[PDB]
Design a protein around this motif. Sequence first.
Motif, PDB file in Angstrom:
ATOM      1  N   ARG B   9      47.660  38.279  32.984  1.00  0.00           N
ATOM      2  CA  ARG B   9      46.457  38.178  33.745  1.00  0.00           C
ATOM      3  C   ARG B   9      46.759  38.137  35.245  1.00  0.00           C
ATOM      4  NH1 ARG B   9      44.076  34.279  30.925  1.00  0.00           N
ATOM      5  NH2 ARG B   9      44.800  32.547  32.246  1.00  0.00           N
ATOM      6  N   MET B  13      45.625  40.773  38.153  1.00  0.00           N
ATOM      7  CA  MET B  13      44.967  40.460  39.407  1.00  0.00           C
ATOM      8  C   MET B  13      45.735  41.037  40.582  1.00  0.00           C
ATOM      9  SD  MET B  13      43.473  36.654  38.819  1.00  0.00           S
ATOM     10  CE  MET B  13      45.081  35.894  38.660  1.00  0.00           C
ATOM     11  N   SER B  25      41.468  33.369  46.775  1.00  0.00           N
ATOM     12  CA  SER B  25      40.212  32.757  46.345  1.00  0.00           C
ATOM     13  C   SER B  25      40.240  32.126  44.951  1.00  0.00           C
ATOM     14  CB  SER B  25      39.070  33.768  46.428  1.00  0.00           C
ATOM     15  OG  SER B  25      38.757  34.018  47.788  1.00  0.00           O
ATOM     16  N   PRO B  26      40.832  32.800  43.937  1.00  0.00           N
ATOM     17  CA  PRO B  26      40.749  32.157  42.616  1.00  0.00           C
ATOM     18  C   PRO B  26      41.507  30.842  42.616  1.00  0.00           C
ATOM     19  CG  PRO B  26      41.420  34.461  42.415  1.00  0.00           C
ATOM     20  CD  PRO B  26      41.559  34.081  43.868  1.00  0.00           C
ATOM     21  N   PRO B  27      40.821  29.726  42.338  1.00  0.00           N
ATOM     22  CA  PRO B  27      41.532  28.444  42.423  1.00  0.00           C
ATOM     23  C   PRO B  27      42.658  28.349  41.375  1.00  0.00           C
ATOM     24  CG  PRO B  27      39.323  28.167  41.495  1.00  0.00           C
ATOM     25  CD  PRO B  27      39.402  29.574  41.962  1.00  0.00           C
ATOM     26  N   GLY B  28      42.524  29.086  40.277  1.00  0.00           N
ATOM     27  CA  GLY B  28      43.603  29.189  39.308  1.00  0.00           C
ATOM     28  C   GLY B  28      44.905  29.774  39.846  1.00  0.00           C
TER      29      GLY B  28
ATOM     30  N   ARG C  92      27.236  31.190  48.333  1.00  0.00           N
ATOM     31  CA  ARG C  92      28.698  31.141  48.306  1.00  0.00           C
ATOM     32  C   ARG C  92      29.219  29.858  47.645  1.00  0.00           C
ATOM     33  NH1 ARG C  92      33.280  33.841  51.950  1.00  0.00           N
ATOM     34  NH2 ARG C  92      32.216  35.507  50.756  1.00  0.00           N
ATOM     35  N   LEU C  93      30.005  30.015  46.582  1.00  0.00           N
ATOM     36  CA  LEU C  93      30.578  28.883  45.840  1.00  0.00           C
ATOM     37  C   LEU C  93      32.042  28.619  46.171  1.00  0.00           C
ATOM     38  CD1 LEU C  93      29.191  29.567  42.247  1.00  0.00           C
ATOM     39  CD2 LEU C  93      28.408  27.817  43.865  1.00  0.00           C
ATOM     40  N   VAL C  94      32.689  29.576  46.823  1.00  0.00           N
ATOM     41  CA  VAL C  94      34.117  29.495  47.110  1.00  0.00           C
ATOM     42  C   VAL C  94      34.369  29.618  48.608  1.00  0.00           C
ATOM     43  CG1 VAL C  94      36.362  30.659  46.843  1.00  0.00           C
ATOM     44  CG2 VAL C  94      34.832  30.418  44.863  1.00  0.00           C
TER      45      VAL C  94
ATOM     46  N   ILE D   4      42.497  43.761  29.848  1.00  0.00           N
ATOM     47  CA  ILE D   4      42.087  42.467  30.377  1.00  0.00           C
ATOM     48  C   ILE D   4      40.704  42.571  31.001  1.00  0.00           C
ATOM     49  CG2 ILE D   4      42.613  40.662  32.045  1.00  0.00           C
ATOM     50  CD1 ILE D   4      45.568  41.040  31.397  1.00  0.00           C
ATOM     51  N   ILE D   9      39.092  36.962  33.714  1.00  0.00           N
ATOM     52  CA  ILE D   9      39.416  36.455  35.043  1.00  0.00           C
ATOM     53  C   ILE D   9      38.364  35.464  35.526  1.00  0.00           C
ATOM     54  CG2 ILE D   9      40.054  37.058  37.408  1.00  0.00           C
ATOM     55  CD1 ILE D   9      41.798  38.357  35.498  1.00  0.00           C
ATOM     56  N   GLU D  12      38.720  32.269  33.165  1.00  0.00           N
ATOM     57  CA  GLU D  12      39.974  31.524  33.242  1.00  0.00           C
ATOM     58  C   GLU D  12      40.415  31.168  34.642  1.00  0.00           C
ATOM     59  OE1 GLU D  12      40.937  30.278  30.642  1.00  0.00           O
ATOM     60  OE2 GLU D  12      39.496  31.514  29.514  1.00  0.00           O
ATOM     61  N   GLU D  13      40.131  32.027  35.612  1.00  0.00           N
ATOM     62  CA  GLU D  13      40.688  31.842  36.943  1.00  0.00           C
ATOM     63  C   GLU D  13      39.682  31.225  37.922  1.00  0.00           C
ATOM     64  OE1 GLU D  13      43.891  32.292  37.243  1.00  0.00           O
ATOM     65  OE2 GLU D  13      43.996  33.079  35.190  1.00  0.00           O
ATOM     66  N   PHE D  14      38.393  31.315  37.597  1.00  0.00           N
ATOM     67  CA  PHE D  14      37.370  30.673  38.419  1.00  0.00           C
ATOM     68  C   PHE D  14      36.654  29.541  37.683  1.00  0.00           C
ATOM     69  CE2 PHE D  14      37.076  32.807  42.424  1.00  0.00           C
ATOM     70  CZ  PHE D  14      37.683  34.037  42.209  1.00  0.00           C
ATOM     71  N   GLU D  17      38.513  26.046  36.533  1.00  0.00           N
ATOM     72  CA  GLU D  17      38.983  25.125  37.557  1.00  0.00           C
ATOM     73  C   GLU D  17      37.831  24.597  38.396  1.00  0.00           C
ATOM     74  OE1 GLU D  17      39.553  28.167  36.959  1.00  0.00           O
ATOM     75  OE2 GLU D  17      41.667  28.723  36.953  1.00  0.00           O
ATOM     76  N   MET D  18      36.799  25.416  38.570  1.00  0.00           N
ATOM     77  CA  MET D  18      35.633  25.022  39.348  1.00  0.00           C
ATOM     78  C   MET D  18      34.701  24.147  38.519  1.00  0.00           C
ATOM     79  SD  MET D  18      34.927  28.530  41.461  1.00  0.00           S
ATOM     80  CE  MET D  18      33.573  27.982  42.507  1.00  0.00           C
ATOM     81  N   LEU D  58      32.176  34.563  45.541  1.00  0.00           N
ATOM     82  CA  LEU D  58      33.457  33.941  45.215  1.00  0.00           C
ATOM     83  C   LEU D  58      34.547  34.262  46.229  1.00  0.00           C
ATOM     84  CD1 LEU D  58      33.498  34.741  41.399  1.00  0.00           C
ATOM     85  CD2 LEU D  58      33.057  32.483  42.370  1.00  0.00           C
TER      86      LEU D  58
END
Lengths: 65, 66, 95, 94
Positions: B9, B13, B25-28, C92-94, D4, D9, D12-14, D17-18, D58
């Motif tokens: 993954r 990205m 940006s992605p907090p992950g 905007r959330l991020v 994928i 994404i 799992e990636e946003f 965690e948010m 985002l």
Amino acid sequence: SDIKSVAERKLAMLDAATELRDLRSPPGNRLESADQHSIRVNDQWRLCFTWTEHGPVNVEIVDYH
Amino acid sequence: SDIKSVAERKLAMLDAATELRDLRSPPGNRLESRADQHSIRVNDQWRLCFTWTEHGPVNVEIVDYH
Amino acid sequence: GMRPIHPGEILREEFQKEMGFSAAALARALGVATPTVNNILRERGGVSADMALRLSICLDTTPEFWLNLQTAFDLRTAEQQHGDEIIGSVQRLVA
Amino acid sequence: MRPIHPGEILREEFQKEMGFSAAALARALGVATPTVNNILRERGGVSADMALRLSICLDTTPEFWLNLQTAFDLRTAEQQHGDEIIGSVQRLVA
């Protein structure tokens, strides 16, 4: 027909390209030459560029005469 | 969860990214360090290191600190 | 981003005009119904992942080449038609 | 390797965690909640429009989302219809 519109289209193709074949295959490109290659915009102008794993780089215009 | 799946993954990205914000940006990703090398979290042990260019991620490596 | 360039424009102007095939001939090579090729050549419809593969094999290109043009076209279009509407709406959330 | 879905994404990636729910995301984007959940549950794709809303919401690029969609549709097609297509298509260009 219009040179501006043709240029815009050649630029689009360069940005979309993923392998050199994307620029060599379309016969409207008349592609000529890791070395630099170029594509026909029209009778007078060509877009020169170097092909890279990351696509086209050092793009320039050339009027060969 | 599975580490391989997460890696797949992260590689996805990286290949899809158009701007550094796509990785920041992605907090992950928990991005850490704009021209300097950056890294994204794969898990607590492994991170993908890379350099950002105009043309996307370059010199992608794995690093385990430490 | 300037004008949107439909992948149909590339197909028509950079392949069809120089080679000379008819819509139906290309449709026969790709293995699809002729209206599907028209749709594209007349810039009336998009290129699917499936159509991208057929084109790529038929015309010696990558499939991503065709989807990238479709991407940029759909995106220029959306930004022209709904851009100013959307950028004023979305929360905007991020950071 | 495996296709994928851009929804993976997002989830799992946003989302993880948010913490936001599908509805909260949907409200932020200005779309009906089932549109977001289709994506999160990987049952539908991301349009150029959706990509714009996502990128503004985002802090990403819209091409980020379309590239994932592109890679996904293409891997899928390739491993569903690939051999069927390579075996049948006529080659018109050297």
